[PDB]
């Protein structure tokens, strides 16, 4: 933007740079259409054009090679989903000139034969390639919508907020009483529709008129406003049917111990406690590594189906190092010791959601990752660990304390090239 950005290019051109395919990111624009692309397709590139072959696809980046070049000398990388690239036949339909690049002019007086020879029975870009890209490029939200958003100052409560900015499906949410707020993706589990808090039984901070509106929607009927962000705009991993129609999938009871990603420190998985069971599978969790203080205040809401909660012992079995409970010791800490101390009970494996999606991520893969500690930053990152469904992502050239445990389907992770597509500043390794 106004300040510049990091470019992947110096890294792109080495045979050790492995990038997560766009296919890995269900929220990424062009995710579906992308696996129709192939590492051999021909394409029209460059007021005049030429055909080139895609030799290599890394994230959104494609290695182009012009026709009639003996060597890789003039191979060039493009952002496939936003370069001046078209499917073979584009020029002919529009009357645009196909002129050989200066370096190879001499090869022929006339070029139709050569090209026809190269283009016959050759693949190009999927049917409606760029339309599909542009459709997914749009936000479900629009500027000026009010929603209920986790209060960054009091994580045990949501606070009325407003969509103020949108850059590539990432929203800025400004709180009602404030010029403070945060960035988060459209799909993130910490933003909610108006009425959510009083539906679920979660704590709410909002204006008087709004507090009255929600109360007068639960004693009687929901009054919907023109600027309400409503349920249809939000991603949910379940439906309300499951709770009111079929027998409730509810299983956690208050007091059950478990393990959870620390919402205040994504590099940490800790013992936690179910502190209040809300409606529709939502529950208030307390991370036990905190100083005994969170009395209502620092409790956090995870839905029972969240891929950030795990049975006790999860770290142990998976060779993840656990953050021990407050007053305990990493060399010493044992669940069986902790439970006998606290006289508490641990939630059984059967209570947790255990589906391992076919995510395709693997150790060493490069990707772009939002910094949840500062979500205006999207940064160069690597898949440091893949534990079934769960990823440890490391920010290249930062320490390990900045690492983030994220779900493989997190909306905070993006294919290399996302930033330039969406037009967002990209942070490279620090120097």
């Amino acid at each position: 933007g106004a300040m510049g950005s990091y470019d992947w290019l110096p890294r792109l051109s080495k045979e050790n740079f492995n990038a997560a395919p766009v296919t890995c990111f269900p929220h990424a624009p062009g995710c579906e259409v992308w696996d129709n692309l192939g590492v051999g397709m021909k394409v029209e590139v460059e007021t005049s054009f030429w055909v080139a072959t895609i030799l290599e696809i890394k994230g959104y980046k494609a290695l182009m090679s012009y026709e009639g070049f003996d060597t890789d000398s003039h191979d060039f990388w493009v952002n496939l989903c936003n370069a001046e690239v078209h499917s073979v036949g584009w020029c002919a339909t529009r009357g645009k000139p196909l002129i050989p690049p200066r370096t190879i002019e001499h090869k022929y007086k006339d070029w139709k034969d050569f090209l026809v020879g190269r283009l016959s029975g050759a693949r190009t870009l999927p049917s409606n390639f760029y339309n599909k890209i542009n459709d997914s490029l749009q936000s479900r939200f629009r500027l000026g919508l009010n929603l209920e958003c986790v209060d960054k100052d009091r994580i045990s409560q949501v606070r009325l907020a407003t969509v103020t900015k949108i850059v590539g499906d990432r929203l800025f949410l400004r709180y009602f009483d404030s010029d403070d707020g945060f960035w988060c993706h459209e799909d993130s589990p910490i933003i909610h529709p108006v009425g959510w808090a009083t539906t679920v039984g979660h704590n709410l901070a909002a204006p008087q008129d709004y507090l009255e509106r929600m109360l007068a929607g639960r004693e009687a009927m929901i009054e919907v406003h023109e600027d309400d962000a409503t349920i249809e705009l939000f991603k949910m991993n379940f439906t309300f049917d499951e709770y009111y129609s079929d027998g409730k999938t509810n299983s956690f009871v208050e007091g059950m111990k478990l393990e959870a990603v620390d919402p205040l420190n994504l590099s940490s998985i800790c013992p936690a406690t179910v502190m209040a069971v809300l409606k529709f599978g939502y529950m208030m969790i307390r991370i036990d590594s905190y100083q005994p203080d969170a009395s209502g205040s620092d409790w956090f809401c995870y839905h029972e189906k969240s891929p950030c909660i795990f049975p006790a012992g999860f770290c142990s079995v998976n060779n993840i190092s656990v953050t021990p409970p407050n007053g305990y010791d990493s060399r010493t800490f044992t669940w069986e010791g902790y439970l006998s101390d606290t006289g508490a009970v641990a939630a059984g494996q059967h209570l947790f959601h255990d589906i391992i999606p076919d995510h395709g991520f693997e150790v060493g893969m490069s990707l772009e990752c939002a910094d949840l500690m500062d979500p205006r930053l999207v940064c160069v990152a690597t898949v440091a660990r893949v534990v079934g469904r769960l990823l440890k992502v490391h920010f290249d050239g930062w320490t390990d304390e900045y690492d983030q445990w994220l779900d493989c389907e997190s909306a905070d992770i993006y294919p290399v090239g996302w930033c330039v597509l969406v037009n967002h500043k990209l942070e490279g390794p620090p120097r």
Binding site: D371, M373, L377, P430
Partner: peptide
Amino acid sequence: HRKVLR
């Protein structure tokens, strides 16, 4: 802040 502007 912990991350300085870059």
